[PDB]
Amino acid sequence: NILLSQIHSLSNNLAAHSHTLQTTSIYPSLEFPVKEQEPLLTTLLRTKALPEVEEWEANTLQEYEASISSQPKKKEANDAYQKDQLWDQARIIFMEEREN
Amino acid sequence: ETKWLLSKVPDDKSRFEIELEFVQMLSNPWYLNFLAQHKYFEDEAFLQYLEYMEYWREPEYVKFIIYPTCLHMLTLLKNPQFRNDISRADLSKQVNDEIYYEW
Amino acid sequence: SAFPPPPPYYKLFTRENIEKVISNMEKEAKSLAKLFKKPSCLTSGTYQMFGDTWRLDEANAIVGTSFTRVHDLIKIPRRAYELRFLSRSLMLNFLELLGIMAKAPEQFPSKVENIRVLLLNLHHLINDYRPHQSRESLIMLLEKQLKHEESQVELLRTHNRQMTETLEKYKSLDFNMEKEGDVIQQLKSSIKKP
Amino acid sequence: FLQGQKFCFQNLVHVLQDIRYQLSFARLRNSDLVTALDILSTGTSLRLANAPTSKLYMLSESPLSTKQILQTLHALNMLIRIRLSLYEIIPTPFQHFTIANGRCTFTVPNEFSVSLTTNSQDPKSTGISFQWIVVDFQFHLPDFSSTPAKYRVFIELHLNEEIAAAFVLQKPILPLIYNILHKFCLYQRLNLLSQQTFQLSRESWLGHLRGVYDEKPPRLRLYYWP
Amino acid sequence: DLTSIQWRMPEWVQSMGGLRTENVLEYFSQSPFYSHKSNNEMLKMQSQFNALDLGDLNSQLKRLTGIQFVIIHERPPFLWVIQKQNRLNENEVKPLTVYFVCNENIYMAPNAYTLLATRMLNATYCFQKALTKIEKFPQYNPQEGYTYPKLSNDNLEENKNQSIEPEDFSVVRAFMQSLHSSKEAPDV
Amino acid sequence: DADISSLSLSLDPEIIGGQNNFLENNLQQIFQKIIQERGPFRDLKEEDLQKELQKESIKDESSAKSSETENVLEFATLDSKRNVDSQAYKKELIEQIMIAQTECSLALDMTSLLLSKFKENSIETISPFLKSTVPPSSLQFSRSQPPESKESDATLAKCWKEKSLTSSCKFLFEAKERLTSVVETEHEYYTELVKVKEASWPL
Amino acid sequence: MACRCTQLQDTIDEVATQFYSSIHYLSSHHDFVSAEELQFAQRDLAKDLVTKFMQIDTLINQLPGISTAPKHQLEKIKKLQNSIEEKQLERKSLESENEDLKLQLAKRIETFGRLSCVLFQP
């Protein structure tokens, strides 16, 4: 739950902050040691997640595409906006019954 | 019967050449880490190490030049099982060779 | 260079191929399966001291005399005294340069090429006697081994004479316990006393 | 040379000095191989290899069985009773009968055992049976004796730890250990007896009689009837 | 791909003996990271025309519009800062990635948000994974409470208050305490 | 030349020839080989004598077995590499949380390296090894690029939410199962308590 | 050490570089108003270099393998192996030949260890 508070404030700070962050790019400056200190910072420059988990995301893409193999041509996202929008209205109706 | 046919496009003259030619590239401790991807490690890759066992034998032994390869050979001979083919041992492993280079 | 550094030979390396070879162990009892058998070796860099006579051809005359040595006294006197003569005639060449210079200073330095070409004579026989140096190191190290085995004589023989002579003592022979009789040794030699 | 130039097609790694006078000594070592055989076990030594360094932590391990460790136990079968023939002196009462591990069985009292765990050969000179450890604590006291796990943990631990602390200083050393031995087990006697006093006080028969184990340094008050 | 990955042809450096000034953009020209309609490369095309008219770099570069790889912070003898950019004027600049000499490698500089998202995702993934192959083993009961089934429990082995009206150590704890007091009892 | 085998002593002229004897050598050995516990091993010392007896009687009088040859014997070890709970959940949890959380500590540390360019009340929280090494104000941001975008964004953004809500469904349903079962179990107690209290008994 | 003629070469080509060191004192130090003392330094080189050469000759004097007959010095090694290879297992055979008695003799020391223990407790 406390972690939910953490993800709460963190996701809160993602906000429009990402609007600035997308233009951002890390680089060490003049006081950064040069001889062989770099590679750990290259790991710091390495945005790579868990290779097994990035493999998992690849699995989600390829296997959703396998679902596409089961369903060769079926758009849904356009009316899926009304999926989430029906969530958006039904939540309100839910609140209505709550207030009643 | 047709294991050579399993190759997508290889067969190749192979022979002694690229064997030792890459054995000296095995020598680098810095090379250790990269082997922690998919190119080879504890999977079917292990077979490479298990057939490169012939070097201790006469004739093959002469063409060894950089016993750092023999020390990586010590790594496979040691439980690379452990971190030696996993987490061990950062840039210090190169130092562990550099010391061997120092002495 | 490497193309790229990882081997492209990984499927050759696959375990299950060799597992099929396990099935193949009785195959030719009556593929890569024989390609997992040991590879032909390079001949290959069998060439000798290419930096010798060919370099002498690249010039070597005193070095040619050094070639004559390959049959003080014996071959030595050239190797020593002619070597001195080369070093000292070399000193004379330093007189050839440093002795006169400023008067149109380009000819003598051009003769320095002649000097070092004459200096090419030196190194080769010395590196011919270099393996001989290594042979000397071999002869030196060869019986330090024999020193170690002699140490075994130095100590094992002491254990011999001394542990054997001391095998008989106030304890008499070490076998004086006489096994079962020694069960009485805590009593018949002790408790029996009165 | 030619084979080397053939092997040259690689990334800048090998990996050591470009100089190869030792490799010239390796071709010379091939000449030594012409001078060698026997032996194949010596071929690396003929190659002058398998020992470039060992200071590194790494791992360093090999198969080890079986007679090895047992023969070393025979080496202890000499050394230990050697030190017994030496020093020894004291801390009696005693009737030791060591085999492998140092025997120190008692009577109605309890088990004691010794296990040296340091550097090897220091006889006569420092022959006073110094190094040992609490082994399998297993006290033989009849009223209570079993010794599960946690006892052997926390007790044997700090025992041997402060035994090493005793090594840190000028020697008492063993007799202190010999003290702590009877100390602990007899304290355990104190609360066996105390638990007996509650075998009478907590239940049958009657009350008033007591033997409460005070928090003070140990005492058992056998107060009676009024 | 653009991060911590090898891309090396060392023998070029072996010839050069290392980088100097404009030669960094040579091995960089070998790199994919190098752009073809960069002002470095279209004025490389100028080198294929005017040749002489390029100066050092930045004079010919920044005065002319397009993608560029300008130099600002040297870090001898290894790193050298070289930012990608897009001039829209002889005066105006629209800087891009700081490509940098990672030594026999040069990389685009990662977003902070990328790695941050990596951290967020991996952490919450650890949370969810903690909820994966772990949860629903302590089965709930109003009476028994959470339960922990086993082939063998060992190992080891809002209700009510009023009721009927080990110490695995055999008081061994106090005995050890007494041992602490007693080891120096003669001594103290 | 067996002396070449004795040139190991020459290797001992080139090296210390290992630590050899050690109590620690007897400790890894206390771990290594049969059996365990040096006291219990001492109890086994007579049985160890039995091990030196007929236990080692096995010898060599059989087929060479060419199939075993040669380096493939190691391939059998590879076959071992392939073919061959309380705390443990919490254990692996300590593992994963270690990785992620310490990585986040690196987040705090390197972001501190970035913000150390100005305010000094930020670099202070970095892990102790770092300040001992790299000086603060080292990292610096660059202005660059949108940078890029792909369809995998929206596609995973959809499919993962689908999987999430469905995970909630599986959760609610299987939890419904366990709860219903808890009802099925718990009811017997209070029925027997009908036999108790509804039959008038103390509670 | 060995190949010490190369060590002499260290006093040759490197001494040849020392001549180059001697070279760099006349670039423009004259009319730009010591070099006279530098001539005495030239005398110092006349000492040093030549004496080094004498040293070279002295190490020439004792080239190892003065017989200079590898064709027969290897034969010397052959005879040396005619000794050593015979001595190999022979010297080490003594080890087991000893322990075959002495191990049990040491246990005899242990038996009089029994009796020593008997003496311990009258």
Short mmCIF file of all heavy atoms in Angstrom, two decimals, chain D residues 10-12 144 150-151 154-155 162 176 180 183-184 187-188 191 213, chain E residues 8 10-11 168-172 174-176 178-180 182-183 186, unseen atoms left out:
data_model
loop_
_atom_site.label_atom_id
_atom_site.label_comp_id
_atom_site.label_asym_id
_atom_site.label_seq_id
_atom_site.Cartn_x
_atom_site.Cartn_y
_atom_site.Cartn_z
N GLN D 10 41.74 -10.64 -36.24
CA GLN D 10 40.92 -10.62 -35.04
C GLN D 10 40.95 -9.25 -34.36
O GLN D 10 41.76 -8.39 -34.72
CB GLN D 10 41.37 -11.70 -34.07
N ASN D 11 40.07 -9.06 -33.38
CA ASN D 11 40.05 -7.84 -32.59
C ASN D 11 41.33 -7.73 -31.76
O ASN D 11 41.95 -8.74 -31.43
CB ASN D 11 38.83 -7.80 -31.69
N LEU D 12 41.72 -6.50 -31.44
CA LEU D 12 42.99 -6.25 -30.77
C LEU D 12 43.02 -6.87 -29.38
O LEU D 12 42.91 -6.16 -28.38
CB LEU D 12 43.27 -4.76 -30.70
N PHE D 144 19.51 -34.43 32.08
CA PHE D 144 19.11 -33.78 30.84
C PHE D 144 20.23 -33.84 29.81
O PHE D 144 21.31 -33.30 30.04
CB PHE D 144 18.72 -32.33 31.12
CG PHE D 144 18.33 -31.57 29.89
CD1 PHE D 144 17.06 -31.70 29.35
CD2 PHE D 144 19.23 -30.71 29.27
CE1 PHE D 144 16.70 -31.00 28.22
CE2 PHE D 144 18.87 -30.01 28.14
CZ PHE D 144 17.60 -30.15 27.61
N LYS D 150 20.19 -25.25 18.15
CA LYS D 150 20.51 -23.87 18.54
C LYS D 150 21.54 -23.79 19.66
O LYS D 150 22.31 -22.83 19.72
CB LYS D 150 19.24 -23.14 18.97
CG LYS D 150 18.26 -22.86 17.85
CD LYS D 150 17.05 -22.10 18.36
CE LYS D 150 16.06 -21.81 17.24
NZ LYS D 150 16.65 -20.93 16.20
N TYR D 151 21.55 -24.79 20.53
CA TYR D 151 22.55 -24.84 21.58
C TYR D 151 23.94 -24.93 20.95
O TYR D 151 24.83 -24.14 21.26
CB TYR D 151 22.32 -26.04 22.49
CG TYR D 151 21.03 -26.01 23.28
CD1 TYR D 151 20.32 -27.17 23.52
CD2 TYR D 151 20.55 -24.82 23.81
CE1 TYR D 151 19.14 -27.16 24.24
CE2 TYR D 151 19.38 -24.79 24.54
CZ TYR D 151 18.68 -25.97 24.75
OH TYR D 151 17.51 -25.95 25.48
N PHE D 154 24.70 -21.20 19.25
CA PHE D 154 25.07 -20.01 20.01
C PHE D 154 26.11 -20.31 21.08
O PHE D 154 26.94 -19.45 21.39
CB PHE D 154 23.82 -19.39 20.65
CG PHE D 154 24.07 -18.07 21.32
CD1 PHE D 154 24.07 -16.89 20.58
CD2 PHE D 154 24.30 -17.99 22.69
CE1 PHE D 154 24.28 -15.67 21.19
CE2 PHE D 154 24.52 -16.77 23.30
CZ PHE D 154 24.51 -15.61 22.55
N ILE D 155 26.09 -21.52 21.64
CA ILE D 155 27.03 -21.83 22.72
C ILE D 155 28.42 -22.04 22.16
O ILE D 155 29.36 -21.31 22.48
CB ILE D 155 26.61 -23.09 23.50
CG1 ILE D 155 25.26 -22.87 24.18
CG2 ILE D 155 27.64 -23.43 24.55
CD1 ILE D 155 24.69 -24.13 24.79
N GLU D 162 35.70 -16.70 21.93
CA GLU D 162 36.49 -16.14 23.01
C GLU D 162 37.66 -17.05 23.37
O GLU D 162 38.57 -16.64 24.09
CB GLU D 162 35.62 -15.85 24.22
CG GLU D 162 34.65 -14.71 23.96
CD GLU D 162 33.74 -14.42 25.13
OE1 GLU D 162 33.71 -15.22 26.09
OE2 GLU D 162 33.06 -13.37 25.10
N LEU D 176 40.83 -22.09 31.28
CA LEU D 176 39.64 -21.24 31.31
C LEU D 176 38.47 -21.93 30.64
O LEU D 176 37.33 -21.86 31.10
CB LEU D 176 39.89 -19.92 30.58
CG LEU D 176 40.90 -18.92 31.11
CD1 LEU D 176 41.00 -17.80 30.10
CD2 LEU D 176 40.45 -18.39 32.45
N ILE D 180 34.80 -22.99 32.05
CA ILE D 180 33.53 -22.61 31.46
C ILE D 180 32.69 -23.86 31.20
O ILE D 180 31.45 -23.84 31.32
CB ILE D 180 33.74 -21.82 30.16
CG1 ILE D 180 34.49 -20.52 30.47
CG2 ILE D 180 32.41 -21.51 29.50
CD1 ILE D 180 35.01 -19.81 29.25
N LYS D 183 31.18 -24.87 34.46
CA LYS D 183 30.33 -23.71 34.76
C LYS D 183 28.95 -23.87 34.15
O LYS D 183 27.97 -24.03 34.88
CB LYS D 183 30.96 -22.42 34.24
CG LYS D 183 32.16 -21.94 35.01
CD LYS D 183 32.77 -20.72 34.36
CE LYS D 183 33.98 -20.23 35.13
NZ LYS D 183 34.65 -19.08 34.45
N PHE D 184 28.89 -23.87 32.83
CA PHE D 184 27.60 -23.87 32.14
C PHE D 184 26.71 -25.05 32.52
O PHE D 184 25.55 -24.86 32.92
CB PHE D 184 27.83 -23.85 30.63
CG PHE D 184 26.58 -24.03 29.82
CD1 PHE D 184 25.71 -22.97 29.62
CD2 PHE D 184 26.29 -25.25 29.24
CE1 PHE D 184 24.56 -23.14 28.87
CE2 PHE D 184 25.14 -25.42 28.49
CZ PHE D 184 24.28 -24.36 28.31
N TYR D 187 25.36 -24.83 35.93
CA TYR D 187 24.31 -23.82 36.04
C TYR D 187 23.02 -24.49 35.61
O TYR D 187 21.93 -24.28 36.18
CB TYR D 187 24.58 -22.62 35.14
CG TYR D 187 25.92 -21.96 35.35
CD1 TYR D 187 26.61 -21.42 34.29
CD2 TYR D 187 26.48 -21.87 36.62
CE1 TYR D 187 27.84 -20.82 34.46
CE2 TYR D 187 27.70 -21.27 36.81
CZ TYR D 187 28.38 -20.74 35.73
OH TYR D 187 29.60 -20.13 35.90
N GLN D 188 23.16 -25.32 34.58
CA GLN D 188 22.04 -26.04 34.04
C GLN D 188 21.54 -27.01 35.09
O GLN D 188 20.34 -27.27 35.19
CB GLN D 188 22.43 -26.73 32.73
CG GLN D 188 21.26 -27.21 31.90
CD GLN D 188 21.67 -27.58 30.49
OE1 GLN D 188 22.82 -27.42 30.10
NE2 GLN D 188 20.71 -28.03 29.70
N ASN D 191 19.30 -24.93 37.47
CA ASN D 191 17.90 -24.81 37.11
C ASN D 191 17.17 -26.12 36.83
O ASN D 191 15.94 -26.12 36.72
CB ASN D 191 17.72 -23.86 35.94
CG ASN D 191 17.70 -22.43 36.39
OD1 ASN D 191 17.38 -22.15 37.54
ND2 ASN D 191 18.03 -21.52 35.50
N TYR D 213 14.08 -19.16 41.33
CA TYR D 213 15.39 -18.86 40.79
C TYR D 213 15.55 -17.36 40.57
O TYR D 213 15.07 -16.81 39.58
CB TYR D 213 15.61 -19.62 39.48
CG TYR D 213 16.95 -19.37 38.85
CD1 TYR D 213 18.10 -19.96 39.35
CD2 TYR D 213 17.07 -18.54 37.74
CE1 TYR D 213 19.32 -19.74 38.76
CE2 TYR D 213 18.29 -18.31 37.15
CZ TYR D 213 19.41 -18.92 37.67
OH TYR D 213 20.64 -18.69 37.08
N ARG E 8 33.35 -1.84 -33.15
CA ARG E 8 34.76 -1.50 -33.19
C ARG E 8 35.48 -2.05 -34.42
O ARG E 8 35.32 -3.21 -34.80
CB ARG E 8 35.44 -1.98 -31.91
CG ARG E 8 35.43 -3.49 -31.69
CD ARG E 8 36.07 -3.86 -30.35
NE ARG E 8 36.14 -5.30 -30.13
CZ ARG E 8 35.17 -6.03 -29.60
NH1 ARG E 8 34.03 -5.47 -29.23
NH2 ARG E 8 35.34 -7.34 -29.44
N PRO E 10 39.24 -1.49 -34.64
CA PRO E 10 40.37 -0.89 -33.93
C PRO E 10 41.54 -0.55 -34.84
O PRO E 10 42.25 0.40 -34.57
CB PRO E 10 40.77 -1.98 -32.93
CG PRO E 10 40.31 -3.24 -33.56
CD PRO E 10 39.03 -2.89 -34.24
N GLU E 11 41.72 -1.33 -35.90
CA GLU E 11 42.89 -1.19 -36.76
C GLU E 11 42.96 0.19 -37.40
O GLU E 11 44.04 0.66 -37.74
CB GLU E 11 42.87 -2.28 -37.84
CG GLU E 11 42.96 -3.69 -37.28
CD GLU E 11 41.61 -4.23 -36.83
OE1 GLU E 11 40.61 -3.50 -36.94
OE2 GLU E 11 41.56 -5.39 -36.36
N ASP E 168 13.17 -22.53 24.46
CA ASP E 168 13.79 -23.77 23.99
C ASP E 168 15.10 -23.96 24.74
O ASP E 168 15.50 -25.09 25.03
CB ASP E 168 14.02 -23.70 22.48
CG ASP E 168 14.52 -25.01 21.89
OD1 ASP E 168 14.62 -26.01 22.64
OD2 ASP E 168 14.82 -25.04 20.68
N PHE E 169 15.74 -22.85 25.07
CA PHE E 169 16.88 -22.89 25.97
C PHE E 169 16.39 -23.32 27.35
O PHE E 169 15.38 -22.82 27.84
CB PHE E 169 17.58 -21.53 26.00
CG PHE E 169 16.71 -20.40 26.47
CD1 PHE E 169 16.70 -20.02 27.79
CD2 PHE E 169 15.91 -19.72 25.57
CE1 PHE E 169 15.91 -18.98 28.22
CE2 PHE E 169 15.11 -18.68 26.00
CZ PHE E 169 15.11 -18.31 27.32
N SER E 170 17.12 -24.23 27.97
CA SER E 170 16.75 -24.72 29.30
C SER E 170 17.19 -23.69 30.33
O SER E 170 17.96 -24.00 31.23
CB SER E 170 17.39 -26.07 29.59
OG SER E 170 18.80 -25.97 29.64
N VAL E 171 16.67 -22.48 30.17
CA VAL E 171 17.18 -21.28 30.82
C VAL E 171 18.67 -21.17 30.47
O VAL E 171 19.49 -20.66 31.24
CB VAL E 171 16.95 -21.30 32.35
CG1 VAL E 171 17.22 -19.93 32.96
CG2 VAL E 171 15.54 -21.76 32.67
N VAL E 172 19.01 -21.66 29.28
CA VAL E 172 20.39 -21.65 28.79
C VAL E 172 20.87 -20.22 28.58
O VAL E 172 22.06 -19.93 28.73
CB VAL E 172 20.53 -22.46 27.48
CG1 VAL E 172 21.88 -22.23 26.83
CG2 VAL E 172 20.33 -23.93 27.76
N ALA E 174 20.32 -17.44 30.40
CA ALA E 174 20.85 -16.92 31.65
C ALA E 174 22.15 -17.64 32.02
O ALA E 174 23.01 -17.06 32.67
CB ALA E 174 19.84 -17.06 32.77
N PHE E 175 22.27 -18.89 31.60
CA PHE E 175 23.47 -19.67 31.86
C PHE E 175 24.65 -19.11 31.09
O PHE E 175 25.76 -19.03 31.61
CB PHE E 175 23.25 -21.14 31.48
CG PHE E 175 22.19 -21.82 32.29
CD1 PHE E 175 21.54 -22.93 31.79
CD2 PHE E 175 21.82 -21.33 33.53
CE1 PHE E 175 20.55 -23.55 32.52
CE2 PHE E 175 20.84 -21.95 34.27
CZ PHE E 175 20.21 -23.06 33.76
N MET E 176 24.40 -18.71 29.84
CA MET E 176 25.42 -18.10 29.02
C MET E 176 25.79 -16.75 29.60
O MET E 176 26.96 -16.36 29.61
CB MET E 176 24.94 -17.94 27.58
CG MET E 176 24.55 -19.24 26.89
SD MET E 176 25.87 -20.46 26.85
CE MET E 176 27.08 -19.62 25.82
N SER E 178 25.68 -15.95 32.68
CA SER E 178 26.50 -16.29 33.82
C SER E 178 27.88 -16.68 33.36
O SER E 178 28.84 -16.48 34.08
CB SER E 178 25.86 -17.43 34.61
OG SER E 178 25.78 -18.60 33.82
N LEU E 179 27.99 -17.27 32.17
CA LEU E 179 29.29 -17.59 31.62
C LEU E 179 30.06 -16.31 31.31
O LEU E 179 31.28 -16.27 31.46
CB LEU E 179 29.16 -18.45 30.36
CG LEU E 179 28.59 -19.85 30.57
CD1 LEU E 179 28.39 -20.54 29.24
CD2 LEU E 179 29.50 -20.67 31.46
N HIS E 180 29.34 -15.28 30.89
CA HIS E 180 29.97 -14.00 30.61
C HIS E 180 30.48 -13.40 31.90
O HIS E 180 31.59 -12.87 31.96
CB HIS E 180 29.00 -13.03 29.93
CG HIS E 180 28.47 -13.53 28.63
ND1 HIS E 180 29.26 -13.70 27.52
CD2 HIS E 180 27.22 -13.87 28.26
CE1 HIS E 180 28.52 -14.15 26.52
NE2 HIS E 180 27.28 -14.26 26.94
N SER E 182 31.27 -15.08 34.50
CA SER E 182 32.13 -16.02 35.21
C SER E 182 33.46 -16.24 34.53
O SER E 182 34.41 -16.69 35.18
CB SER E 182 31.42 -17.37 35.37
OG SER E 182 31.16 -17.96 34.11
N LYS E 183 33.55 -15.95 33.24
CA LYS E 183 34.79 -16.15 32.53
C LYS E 183 35.86 -15.25 33.12
O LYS E 183 37.04 -15.61 33.18
CB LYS E 183 34.63 -15.86 31.04
CG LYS E 183 35.88 -16.12 30.23
CD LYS E 183 35.68 -15.74 28.78
CE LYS E 183 35.50 -14.24 28.65
NZ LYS E 183 36.72 -13.50 29.08
N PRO E 186 37.05 -14.97 38.20
CA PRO E 186 38.37 -14.87 38.83
C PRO E 186 39.11 -13.59 38.45
O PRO E 186 39.85 -13.03 39.25
CB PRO E 186 39.10 -16.11 38.31
CG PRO E 186 38.45 -16.40 37.01
CD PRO E 186 37.00 -16.09 37.24
#
